[PDB]
Amino acid sequence: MDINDDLNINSPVDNKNVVIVRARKTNTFFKAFKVAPNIWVAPERYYGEPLDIAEEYKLDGGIYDSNFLSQDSERENFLQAIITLLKRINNTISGKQLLSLISTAIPFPYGYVGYRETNYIESQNNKNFYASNIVIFGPGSNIVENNVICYKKNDAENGMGTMAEILFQPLLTYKYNKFYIDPAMELTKCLIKSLYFLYGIKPSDDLVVPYRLRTELDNKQFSQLNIIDLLISGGVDLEFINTNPYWFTNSYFSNSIKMFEKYKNIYETEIEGNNAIGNDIKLRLKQKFQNSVQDIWNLNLNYFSKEFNSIIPDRFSNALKHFYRKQYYTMDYGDNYNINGFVNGQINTKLPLSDKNTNIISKPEKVVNLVNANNISLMKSNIYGDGLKGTTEDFYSTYKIPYNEESDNFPLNNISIEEVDSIPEIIDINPYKDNSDDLLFTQITSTTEEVITHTALPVNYLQAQIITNENFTLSSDFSKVVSSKDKSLVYSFLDNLMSYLETIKNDGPIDTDKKYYLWLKEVFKNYSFDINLTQEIDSSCGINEVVIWFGKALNILNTSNSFVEEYQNSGPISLISKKDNLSEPNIEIDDIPDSLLGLSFKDLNNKLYEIYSKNRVYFRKIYFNFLDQWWTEYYSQYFELICMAKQSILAQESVVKQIIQNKFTDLSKASIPPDTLKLIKETTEKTFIDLSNESQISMNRVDNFLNKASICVFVEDIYPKFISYMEKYINNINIKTREFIQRCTNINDNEKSILINSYTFKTIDFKFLNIQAIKNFFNSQVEQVMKEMLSPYQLLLFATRGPNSNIIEDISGKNTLIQYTESVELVYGVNGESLYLKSPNETVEFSNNFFTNGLTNNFTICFWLRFTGKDDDKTRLIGNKVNNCGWEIYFEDNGLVFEIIDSNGNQESVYLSNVINNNWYYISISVDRLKDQLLIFINDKNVANVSIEQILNIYSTNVISLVNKNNSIYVEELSVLDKPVASEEVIRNYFSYLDNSYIRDSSKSLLEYNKNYQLYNYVFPETSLYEVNDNNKSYLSLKNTDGINIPSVKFKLINIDESKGYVQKWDECIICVSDGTEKYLDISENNRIQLVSSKDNAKKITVNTDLFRPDCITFSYNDKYFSLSLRDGDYNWMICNNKVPKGAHLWILKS
């Protein structure tokens, strides 16, 4: 929105939106572009950070490059890059709100010996003055180095605020596992930081909390992380310090709220409404103060990861440099990146690696040299540092958990954007001369250990799965791979991929597309056997879905003959390298009040409860400290494995893909036709992709598994230790609480008796272990945002009759394009609005990249359908049958036909009987390419399973088309899954859409009041209910001697509420029949239903229904439901009786 899109890098200096201004107070000056109110861009290197720095000084994982941002093309790219990320941040309610606080968050001005501001730029005539809160630069020394620099450090600390400089790198991004991180999200991180600088609450440099324990190292050593980054980081880690209660604290918060107030007050008292002052400023101050310190603190990347839909790491985000060999991709705006986000999502958008990846510094914390018995180097493996400050030493020891105990969810909604975009530009700035400090380069060295080892490490195993040889074969013997003189071996635990590959070793060539598809299929299905091969087991800590290959990949408990049995053996604890890291907490001194010594019973009673209060609260505090250490010292190690195991599956995938690439590189040279290959190729790209889908699944198994084990160790290993410490504290407390009560002069013998007993502490006082909320730690915002982007729905079709308008969208959150006739109307269907096609040419086309299907993709199509369909001849209905490939559902004979076909002409067509009646039918087709198996489910029964093992390449268009010629069709809740389906979910999904509290007809359509339905019993299906006179009246029967002269009966429901349209369960009703008059139903003293012509005789029956039978209701009275009388005339009379068979409970209203 309010972002200036306008400037090319080549816009000249105009003294308005394009200035050349002085950097601090130096005899340096740089070029700048106003993108917004008080927000500028400096599309060149940061000035106060040398460009070619000394090698002795280059840090690990930097890319240093003096020729970066040197060029104009880049300077432009970048200028355009920033503007872009800024606009992408603006299509976001929350982020536009953020940026508006940034616009309006001016640093407070200095006063009378009228008002003089800190937040500005001087020009190089030094007489023109431009307001600025933010300036976004290119990188300083290192080019993957992001950052926020204070203009006047002390102004940033004192409650005042100061201009902020951002160094940014928008031209590179990196992968996190299997998806690319979103650079806009990283800018946001920085904007967030500068609010502290604009507010004047930058936390003191030594307000740092422990982050991760350094167990690559020989002693107890902590990586520590400044409070500010912890908060703005969000993710899992602050969930250990943001606890209720807060266990850790500091002068900074209390003081931050203090000095905020003073500065809020100076505004209130002096600045607001002073007519020497002026609106460009005082208005913005009002706006700076409509937000609190507290708001800015509880603001961070969580709330935005949801809002942007970025996955960005949630565990150990700050120390990733240790866990991750980060990889760098070149960034194209605005083609792969829109005001939308990466066009294609974080997952698909496929970016180019950057040439700079090589210049990336590798200064390992240590180098693991794997040497054999003869002490020769086999392979040397690097172990990287996280970057952070180090101990030294122990924090948990040193920090005294304060004796003194002194919600929300979303942070910037206070800020009204009408209100903000109304305030006139600050134009008259009166400069405070001394607005800036002189700046500082710090620089430092790395020192790296070599270690010799005869013991292969996980870090070695990992290294063993990357390819040395352009020509190569797999192997499961680590040493065989290392000791390849070749070295053409590469380690692999894909035991079956190799098993199959070794068996086809000596066969004929790949010449048919048929022979290739076969192979690719087996390859792929083999990789799936392998990579997600697992087994569930019993620990005390739950059932745990164990990764069967885990041992063989990182070489942990691989020392057995079998991994899985040995995790059983040793415990979750067995998997990590440092197991004794826990460190007694510093707790609180020994006095209960002295002026309680002389109070009497009922007063001392309720103030010993004050002691008890603070105590039970303070136990929680200790607990928290312990948890933090679990995480810090133990989970961190479980994560150590996680990333390794994760990298491992990805390495494995990559073997395969190259194996596959080299098989098409074989394909042909060939007999095969030019355009034939275009397909084999598209297909394999589709298959290469299918593998990745599969690989995610493996990474999740490793995640449940290792995360579980992580908590397994909290329950079994850390917790019992908490118990020991805690009764030490309480037994000791109890000594001293006994001795206080007897020091009491003013309490009686019965006060001594019952206060001793009343206020003592025992073992159940500190049993806090909640394993579920421990497990809840892990579903961070990101791991939730992840849930969704990877979900099996490629489409779920919503539609609403919107504000005088018709919205037909896709709730799945993918590509899925809906292209249709404007003439398509929406009618209530099963549970929401059903697509109504009048049946003419009226066609709707769904569009999604997935829908092209291919060789190895599994997928399910479900949808509701009601069909006013007609003739005996075959008619296309829904399908992606492109020129004789793929699949279609036809109309034919009295049902539907599922036809499914490959590029070779092989087919299983499958006739589904009973569909063309217009009763609603929930069709589910599940095609499993993994198991070669076609399942079809109509409503809640599975109607078919069929072998498709003769079916090959079903590759078609990216469009699944719903046609509906001649025959109006009702379609609702149309879905496409990328998983094949089990009957359980069929039953689950059937009854989900299906129970809404409303009642139905036997066409599964909605039941409304006042409609002429026929009634039948569940017991007697197609014998119509009828009337007959025999005993003093007119009765209700069914004719089981057909043509003993009774004819078909007409029902209608009627309501006490004149307005009410549609029938609901636990509703009240009057049953009517059309005979001679309106006949109203009545239960007699024989409890036999009989038709009366008398309004107040009519019974007020309650309607209810069966939750397993979709189309069925019941009619009843006060616990006596309506059923069918014994076979009688033959006549079966309507009875309200408690002694006949229960299977006559069920009534279908069919119109």
Q: How far apart are CA 601 and CA 604, in angstroms?
A: 5
Residue 325: other Cβ atoms inside 10 A: 13
Angle at 526 between CA 523 and CA 528, to 5 degrees: 115
Report the 3 state secondary structure along 44-99.
CCCCCCCCCCCHHHCCCCCCECCCCCCCHHHHHHHHHHHHHHHHHCCCCHHHHHHH
Q: Which long-range contacts (CB under 8 A, 24 or more apart) does 884-890 make?
A: 885/953, 885/954, 885/955, 885/956, 886/853, 886/954, 886/955, 886/956, 886/957, 887/853, 887/927, 887/954, 887/956, 889/923, 889/925
On whether the CB atoms of residues 36 and 89 are closer than 8 A, the answer is no
Structure tokens belonging to residue 5 = 């899109």
Q: Which residue has the tokens 């005088």?
A: 804
Q: State the method.
A: X-ray
Helices 749-758 + 719-743 axis angle, to 10: 170
Beta strands in 724-873 (DSSP E): 793-802, 805-810, 817-820, 825-828, 833-837, 844-847, 859-867
Q: How far apart are CA 619 and CA 612, in angstroms?
A: 11
On whether the CB atoms of residues 528 and 652 are closer than 8 A, the answer is no
SS3 647: helix
**What backbone phi and psi angles, to 5 degrees, belong to 538?**
-105, 110
Write the CA distances from 944 to 319, 766, 932, integer angstroms.
53, 57, 14
Q: How far apart are CA 298 and CA 252, in angstroms?
A: 15
On whether the CB atoms of residues 655 and 465 are closer than 8 A, the answer is yes
On whether the CB atoms of residues 1144 and 1019 are closer than 8 A, the answer is yes
Write the CA distances from 930 to 309, 698, 948, integer angstroms.
31, 16, 11
Write the CA distances from 45 to 141, 371, 395, integer angstroms.
8, 45, 38
The residues facing 194 across adjacent strands are: none
On whether the CB atoms of residues 936 and 943 are closer than 8 A, the answer is yes
What DSSP state is assigned to residue 878? E
SS3 926: strand
Q: How far apart are CA 899 and CA 923, in angstroms?
A: 14
| H or E, element range at 495 | helix 495-503
Write the CA distances from 645 to 217, 357, 906, integer angstroms.
21, 23, 40
* Residue 767 Cα to chain centre, angstroms: 32
Counting Cβ atoms within 10 Å, is residue 1035 exposed (0-12), middle (13-18) or buried (19+)? buried
Q: Which long-range contacts (CB under 8 A, 24 or more apart) does 613-620 make?
A: 614/403, 614/405, 615/733, 615/761, 616/765, 617/245, 617/405, 618/401, 618/403, 618/405, 618/588, 619/726, 619/765, 619/766, 619/768, 620/243, 620/245, 620/247, 620/768
Report the 3 state secondary structure along 405-459.
CCCCCCCCCCCCHHHHCCCCCCCCCCECCCCCCCCCCCCCCCCCEEEEECCCCHH
Sign of CA dihedral 728, 730, 735, 740: positive
What radius of gyration do the chain's Cα atoms show? 37
Counting Cβ atoms within 10 Å, is residue 932 exposed (0-12), middle (13-18) or buried (19+)? middle
Annotated resolution, angstroms: 3.9
On whether the CB atoms of residues 755 and 775 are closer than 8 A, the answer is no
What DSSP state is assigned to residue 316? S
* Residue partners of 1096: CB distance under 8 A and separation at least 6: none
The residues facing 390 across adjacent strands are: 223
| H or E, element range at 712 | helix 674-713
| H or E, element range at 150 | strand 147-150
On whether the CB atoms of residues 1051 and 1014 are closer than 8 A, the answer is yes
What is the bridge-based pairing of β-strands 875-881 and 959-962? antiparallel
SS3 229: helix
SS3 375: coil
* Residue partners of 988: CB distance under 8 A and separation at least 6: none
Structure tokens belonging to residue 989 = 């999904």
Write the CA distances from 891 to 697, 908, 934, 1142, integer angstroms.
37, 16, 19, 39
Sign of CA dihedral 594, 598, 601, 603: negative
Sign of CA dihedral 798, 802, 808, 809: negative
Q: How far apart are CA 777 and CA 187, in angstroms?
A: 26
Q: How far apart are CA 568 and CA 715, in angstroms?
A: 17
The residues facing 964 across adjacent strands are: none
Q: How far apart are CA 356 and CA 313, in angstroms?
A: 23
Structure tokens belonging to residue 84 = 């872009």
Q: Which long-range contacts (CB under 8 A, 24 or more apart) does 124-131 make?
A: 124/20, 124/21, 124/22, 124/29, 126/22, 128/15, 128/19, 129/429, 129/431, 130/19, 130/21, 130/34, 130/40, 130/429, 131/38, 131/106, 131/425, 131/426, 131/427, 131/429
* Residue partners of 46: CB distance under 8 A and separation at least 6: 137, 138, 139, 140, 149, 165, 167
Q: How far apart are CA 288 and CA 270, in angstroms?
A: 16
On whether the CB atoms of residues 22 and 124 are closer than 8 A, the answer is yes
Question: Quick one: which of 623, 634, 584 has its CA closest to 398?
Answer: 584
CB burial of 326-356 (b: ≥16 within 10 Å; e: otherwise) equals: bebbebebeebbeeebbebbbebbebeebeb
Residue 610: other Cβ atoms inside 10 A: 12
On whether the CB atoms of residues 1139 and 1121 are closer than 8 A, the answer is no
Q: Which residue has the tokens 């071996």?
A: 489
**Domains and their CATH numbers in the chain:** 1-460 (3.90.1240.10), 461-790 (1.20.1120.10), 791-995 (2.60.120.200), 996-1151 (2.80.10.50)
Q: Which long-range contacts (CB under 8 A, 24 or more apart) does 726-731 make?
A: 726/619, 726/622, 726/766, 727/763, 729/587, 729/622, 730/761, 730/762, 730/763, 730/765, 730/766
Q: How far apart are CA 312 and CA 335, in angstroms?
A: 22
